[PDB]
Every structure is written in structure tokens, then in C-alpha cells.
């Protein structure tokens, strides 16, 4: 849905890094280099950013009022 | 941290350390093992869900020191070790 605030495994905060990672990867930079620059060294943290889906945009359209 | 004695035979003390977990229990038993006068010391969590915070100990000494003395000395050594590591850490970080 929306990017998790913390890594499920070790609790490192990765909420802010997702949008930077997405824009840098779309810019054409190497994903490994981007993830290293962001500070995610453990592959548990890299799993959180690499496998996340922004589903909030696709469901914001329907309101419950 | 409540102590709930279960057995008080000669040179044997079995008790529940209510309020703790593996963290303190393991440190206590491993620092008790190095005492030459202790013949058998161990601990166990009877159930991870029901007795998660009630470790159970068995302290058996040869007889020259009572198990209460052994636990007192072990806790004193734990406190001294923690203080020394704290001093070293504060010296290094500063």
C-alpha cells in the first residue's frame, strides 16, 4: 500500500528512502549503487525497498464518506 | 525481581526468578559456572509462552559455600563486569 516505515527484519527506518530510490532508479542509475548510497547494506533492508508496491494511489480514488 | 524458592536441600537451591528472561538468566548461570565451588548450575524456561518470564535455576555446590553465597558472588561479579565495561566504553567514545 504505502511504504513501510521500518524494515520488517531489523527495524531500520526506510520510509523516507523509497521515493529517492525510485526516482534515482528511474533516472537510470545502477540500483545496487543507489541502495549502497542510501545506506541499506543488509539485504533485508534492500528487500523492503526493492519489492514494495505503491498501492495507495490505486485505492485513493474510492471514498467512503 | 521476585525469588520463588522450590527446594532448599543440603547444597541445593532451586527457585523461580520471576520477572526476568533469558538475558539475565544466561549471564547469571555462565558467571556462576566459573566458581570452582559450584558442581552443577543450570537454568531452563519450562514453557516459552506460559513461563516466558519465570526462569528456573538449580544451584548445587560442594558444601564449602551455600548456593545463596554463590548467587551473591555471581551477581557481584556481573555488576563489577558491567561497570568496568561501562568505564571502558565511556573512555573510548569520548
Amino acid at each position: 500500500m504505502i511504504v513501510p516505515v521500518r524494515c520488517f527484519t531489523c527495524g531500520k527506518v526506510i520510509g523516507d528512502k523509497y521515493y529517492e530510490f525510485k526516482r534515482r532508479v528511474e533516472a537510470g542509475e545502477d540500483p545496487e549503487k543507489v541502495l549502497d548510497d542510501l545506506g541499506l547494506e543488509r539485504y533485508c533492508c534492500r528487500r523492503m525497498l526493492l519489492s514494495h508496491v505503491e498501492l495507495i494511489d490505486d485505492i485513493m480514488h474510492y471514498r467512503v464518506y | 525481581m521476585k525469588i520463588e524458592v522450590i527446594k532448599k536441600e543440603e547444597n541445593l537451591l532451586e527457585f523461580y526468578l520471576e520477572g526476568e528472561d533469558h538475558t539475565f538468566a544466561n549471564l547469571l548461570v555462565e558467571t556462576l559456572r566459573e566458581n570452582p565451588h559450584v558442581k552443577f548450575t543450570a537454568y531452563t524456561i519450562e514453557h516459552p509462552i506460559t513461563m516466558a518470564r519465570k526462569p528456573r535455576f538449580r544451584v548445587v555446590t560442594d558444601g564449602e559455600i551455600t548456593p545463596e553465597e554463590a548467587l551473591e558472588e555471581a551477581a557481584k561479579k556481573i555488576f563489577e563486569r558491567a561497570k568496568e565495561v561501562l568505564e571502558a566504553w565511556e573512555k573510548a567514545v569520548k
Partner: protein, 258 residues
């Protein structure tokens, strides 16, 4: 004696060597850092109106996961019994846009989100999100929200690679690539294992006798990372004081028994 030597001191993490200490005390220090040191985290939220797509439970959990700065001087963080001070973080956000953690207010200047760029919810046109979030001290052993950070250690080992080994220079170059401190002699090359040194597939045939590891007794390479709630040095100091107080409480109860 007991020696502490710092390898790499970063802003959000520290890597140090702990020497002259049994494995039990290292594991106890790691466990106390993980689950004893207290921090501030949102434990209860009062929602006045939430028109967003996320439910109240989801937003409350995301608020609880948001790290909060923990003042050190005002509160006794090494006490066995925690204080009941409650910080009221409020939010009055509406209209199109995305709500960040920097939009939260606070009744206490000290307690506030460390990172103001953490997304909370994406709001559409006309949606309003109003709540007052209450934070209190707690321990990571109860819920993961109160965990100060992350911590782990490993054995301080020196890997011996015999110089009689053909193409040992490739192993030396690999050790240099990984950044591990490496020393070489006339008969062998020693690779201090600051980080996990794993022998490649080609050299696995020598893993038995020609190349072998040597565990330095009572030495561990620790790695403590903070989430911004507390300084890492403060985390380690508070954990050590927690262990000291636990030992003191055990001594007092034991004396009470006799």
C-alpha cells in the same frame, strides 16, 4: 583486562571491538540493547476525523513506527520502573497532498519525530486527517515500537592462508576488496575478519588444513545502529546501566530472601 576499541564511528552507527569478556556478557549486552533501553513511541491515538484511505488502525501503527527523539537528561532511562510522562503529538492536516512526519506537532520540544520526511498518508481533495497521538516510554521486549535501534556482534577471527597455496594472491586481492585488514608473512597471509570473510568456491578444497580460521578468545566485533531516537553511545551506556541495576536488584532480593 576489558578493552573497548572503536573501528568505525559513523553518525547513525558505531562498530567497536569488545575484548576480555565472556560470550555470555556479550550476548547479554546485545539483548539489553535490543529490548531493555527505553524510547518514546506512540502508544495511543485519538482520532477526531480520518477521511483518508487508510483505516485508523493502519495510521496508528504507522505513527507508532515513526521514531521519536528521546531526551536523556530529563528522564531516568536506566530505571527498572519507567516514568509515565506522556507527550501529546497532534496533527491538523487536510486537502490534497501527502502527510509527512514533520507535520506532527508536539507539546514537548524534546519529543518529536526524528525524521520529518517519513510518509504517513496520501490525502486527496477534501480529505481531512485530525488526531492527537500520545507517546510514552516502553521497552522493545514488549513491542517492537520501543526498540532503540539494531545491534549484533560476531567473533573476532583471524584467517590464516598458507603462502604455499597456489594463486594465494587472488585471496589477498579479494581480502583487500572486502576492506578487511590483511597482514602477510613469509609463510602465510593473515586476514583479520572485521566483516564476514567467506572463502570462494575454488579455494574450498583447502578449507580444512591449508587455509583455516583462528578465533581470538573473548573478543567480539559489535555493531550498534540507532534509528535517531538516541545517540549510539547513549544506547550502549543505558544498556550497561540497565545491566548494573538488574544485578543490584537481584542482590537486594537475594539478601531479602536470607
Amino acid at each position: 583486562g576489558i578493552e573497548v576499541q572503536i573501528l568505525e564511528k559513523k553518525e547513525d552507527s558505531i562498530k567497536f571491538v569488545l575484548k576480555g569478556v565472556h560470550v555470555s556478557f556479550a550476548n547479554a549486552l546485545r539483548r539489553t540493547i535490543l529490548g531493555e533501553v527505553p524510547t518514546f513511541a506512540v502508544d495511543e491515538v485519538e482520532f477526531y476525523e480520518n477521511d483518508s484511505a487508510l483505516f485508523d488502525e493502519i495510521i496508528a501503527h504507522r505513527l507508532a513506527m515513526i521514531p521519536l527523539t528521546t531526551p536523556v537528561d530529563r528522564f531516568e532511562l536506566d530505571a527498572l520502573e519507567l516514568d509515565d510522562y506522556t507527550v501529546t503529538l497532534s496533527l491538523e492536516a487536510e486537502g490534497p497532498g501527502i502527510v509527512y512526519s514533520g507535520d506532527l506537532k508536539s507539546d514537548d520540544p524534546d519529543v518529536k519525530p526524528v525524521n520529518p520526511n517519513i510518509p504517513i498518508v496520501k490525502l486527496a481533495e477534501g480529505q481531512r486527517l485530525v488526531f492527537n497521538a500520545y507517546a510514552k516510554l516502553g521497552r522493545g521486549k514488549d513491542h517492537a515500537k520501543w526498540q532503540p535501534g539494531f545491534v549484533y556482534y560476531k567473533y573476532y577471527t583471524i584467517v590464516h592462508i598458507s603462502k604455499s597455496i597456489p594463486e594465494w594472491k587472488e585471496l589477498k586481492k579479494l581480502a583487500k576488496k572486502r576492506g578487511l585488514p590483511v597482514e602477510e608473512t613469509e609463510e602465510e597471509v593473515l586476514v583479520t575478519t572485521i566483516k564476514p570473510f567467506y572463502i570462494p568456491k575454488d579455494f574450498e578444497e583447502y578449507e580444512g588444513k591449508e587455509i583455516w580460521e583462528e578465533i581470538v578468545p573473548n573478543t567480539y566485533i559489535f555493531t550498534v545502529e540507532t534509528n535517531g531516537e538516541l545517540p549510539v553511545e547513549e544506547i550502549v551506556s543505558i544498556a550497561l546501566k540497565i545491566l548494573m541495576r538488574k544485578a543490584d536488584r537481584f542482590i537486594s532480593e537475594l539478601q531479602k530472601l536470607t
